[PDB]
Structure 1
């Protein structure tokens, strides 16, 4: 439809991160009016987006998983079923240390922890993804926890793509809301019938 023409200027631009060690990073999610991501007609856009990124963090993109605590498992996942049926890629799993036992077909990005933050060094992580795993572009889709952090990272994020659904999920839903104010620039809105989509960049 006209929706790709709408997205076009916000997709990875190759000459932009070429000759840099950082990948293109887009932040994308779907929220209700009350800014909640949990507790149509979106699916076309999301799939289109996915097929314009090398990696997707949560041809066909490679799944990337944050799992520093090392509880997650590829064996017996839906993602593994898709992979076996030749319609999906195996994951890259972000860890802090080399796992004692590893899984067949799984890659492990060993990424250091930022000394100031309690959490993981995002810029480092994305560099590892690009330099070690040839991920030239990544679409991060979720962890409201993850969204909330990266909203603060204008030195990292390149595109912001938000779908807003014409509904209220309720106050106990998990919210996306950065801990400080965040300004946008180069915004562009699209309107559907029940949805609206925002494309933008992060100022600074």
Structure 2
């Protein structure tokens, strides 16, 4: 199955950037490299054989990270079906989700103990210190702020985010999407060294077409240590990013 297949790619000590958590970038794509169907169309890409794999990967990571738009589009739970704890991290620069906090599935799971209470990553001063105290008391939420010095062209530095997480004793983070985060992380380097340690992609045998949500990085990206797995319907490629 996928367990021996993934054994070299689950978080491990041989990190080229030890001030950062072990970063897994992982997503499910159609053949034409879409990760969501067009607006109004149901998204069916990954089948249960590879959904199980994703749950297994979540059991090996301290944290799971997605962007606001993923939260808005999917209302994900962001816990682990095996029952191991995993900390949800939401990249929400202006805290758009504030008005939905009481409705979110990830908030509910944090309150029911079926999940861990989330961390939202925002720009400086987006959430006032007393709003943070109320949200922390009412929902268990933490707010983590990125200084303006670490924001370039309106994008928070991935290095700054990961260093904060690592300093909060998050030793491994599973970044699951969406397309913006995937595209940025695929090309993000620190002195030629990729921040992503493991890249694990489910390929579903479907086309979602030109109006689906596309993944493609701004330049070409070479992979190393490639290994393929497949089941009845889906295939999975695991790899590292080349220098």
Q: TM-score, normalised by structure 2?
A: 0.78
Looking at structure 1, the residues matched to 91 and 121 of structure 2 have their Cα atoms a distance apart, in angstroms, of 5
Query: Which residue of 56, 66, 76 corresponds with 2:64?
Result: 56
1:27 shift after superposition: 0.3
1:134 paired to 2:159: no
**CA 117–19 in structure 1, closer or farther in 2 if over 3 Å, else same:** closer
Query: Which residue of 23, 45, 48 corresponds with 1:25?
Result: 23
Bigger CA drift: 121-130 or 110-119? 110-119
Alignment of 1:118-157 (within 5 A): 118-131=154-167, 133-154=168-189, 155-157=194-196
SS in 1 for 2:177: coil
Query: Which residue of 23, 42, 65 corresponds with 2:50?
Result: 42
Report the count of equivalent residues: 201
1:128 shift after superposition: 0.2
- Counterpart residue number, 2:73: none
1:75 paired to 2:102: yes
Whether the 8 Å CA contact 1:33–1:167 is kept in 2: the answer is yes
Looking at structure 1, the residues matched to 25 and 61 of structure 2 have their Cα atoms a distance apart, in angstroms, of 12
Looking at structure 2, the residues matched to 145 and 48 of structure 1 have their Cα atoms a distance apart, in angstroms, of 24
Q: State the Cα RMSD in Å.
A: 1.7
- Counterpart residue number, 1:90: 117
- Counterpart residue number, 2:10: 11
Listed one character per residue, the Cα deviations across residues 135-180 of structure 1 (whole Å, up to 9, x for unaligned) are 1100000020000000002521100000000011111001110010
Q: TM-score, normalised by structure 1?
A: 0.93
- Which runs of 5 or more structure 1 residues have no equivalent in the other structure? none
Whether the 8 Å CA contact 1:112–1:121 is kept in 2: the answer is no
**CA 127–32 in structure 1, closer or farther in 2 if over 3 Å, else same:** same
Whether the 8 Å CA contact 1:109–1:129 is kept in 2: the answer is no
**CA 17–35 in structure 1, closer or farther in 2 if over 3 Å, else same:** same
Looking at structure 2, the residues matched to 171 and 188 of structure 1 have their Cα atoms a distance apart, in angstroms, of 28
**CA 97–26 in structure 1, closer or farther in 2 if over 3 Å, else same:** same
- Say which structure is richer in helix: 2
Looking at structure 2, the residues matched to 19 and 84 of structure 1 have their Cα atoms a distance apart, in angstroms, of 34
